[PDB]
Nucleic acid binder design. Structure first.
Ligand SMILES: [Mg+2]
Ligand SMILES: [Mg+2]
Length: 212
DNA sequence: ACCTGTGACAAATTGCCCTCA
DNA sequence: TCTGAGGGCAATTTGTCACAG
DNA sequence: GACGGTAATT
DNA sequence: GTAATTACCG
């Protein structure tokens, strides 16, 4: 049974922009941190490859490029911004990377919490769909169902959606429908929604879900 | 002016393949 | 030989915007 | 490369 | 023929 990720709701609702590969690595960091400290973590290429059904080569490519793409990335808890890394990653041994997570991030990870097993999200491709599945997990009930109304502006400012998704039809076509379809095809969740409006503008999205 | 969706194009990402220390 | 660090790809997805209703 | 199987050399 | 350590090859 795959690793049970838990995280403070403050991270689920933080403002940041990470790729799929970066979020994948981040889940393992959160797992390492929680089992305890000082903040120094490690990643093995071959274990990553086995976890996500990747080759060693493509695993190596994903880790390396995610890792160099962390530089300058920042995290906002609503309104405080932090860098993810305080030192570049580096490899003491072949197939092994050592990373220095900002120790000031530790209390935001382990605290009003969100939890999901890693197999639920490891087939998801779109990172915004990972964000959506995390925010839905934050409201899930023991039995596996839930319902929540999210404000569109808050979705855009938390997930840092790109500017053209401020136009609602592109928001619908390239984010909402794709990430709902992905969740429904790639997780053990079954998700539906309906739109809440005010005048001509759509202001919130109401998600209902149950477990299969 | 506001809303919706679709058609196109560009930019990014994906799972691939190959090569050599 | 088995790893993994590189070097590439075509097909597909994602981000953007012009245009009609 | 890094590691271990296998022949080779004392 | 054996023993055992070793260069090196895959
Ligand atoms: Mg990859
Ligand atoms: Mg999709």
């Amino acid at each position: 049974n795959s690793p049970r990720i838990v995280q403070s709701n403050d991270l689920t609702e933080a403002a940041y922009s990470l790729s799929r590969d970066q979020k994948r690595m981040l889940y393992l960091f959160v797992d390492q941190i929680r089992k305890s400290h000082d903040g120094i973590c490690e990643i093995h290429v071959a274990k990553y490859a086995e976890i996500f059904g990747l080759t060693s080569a493509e695993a190596s490519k994903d880790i390396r490029q995610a890792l160099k793409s962390f530089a300058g990335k920042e995290v906002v808890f609503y309104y405080e911004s932090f860098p993810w890394f305080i030192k570049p990653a580096h490899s003491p041994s072949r197939g092994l990377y050592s990373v220095h997570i900002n120790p000031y991030l530790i209390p935001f990870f382990i605290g009003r919490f969100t939890q999901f097993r890693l197999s639920e999200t490891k087939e998801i491709t779109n990172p915004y769909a990972m964000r959506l599945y995390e925010s839905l997990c934050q409201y899930r009930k023991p039995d596996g169902s839930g319902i929540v109304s999210l404000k569109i502006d808050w979705i855009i400012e938390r997930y840092q959606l790109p500017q053209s998704y401020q136009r609602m039809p592109d928001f619908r076509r390239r984010f909402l429908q794709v990430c709902v379809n992905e969740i429904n095809s790639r997780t053990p969740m079954r998700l539906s929604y309906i739109e809440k409006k005010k005048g001509r503008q759509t202001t919130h999205i109401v998600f209902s879900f149950r477990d299969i």
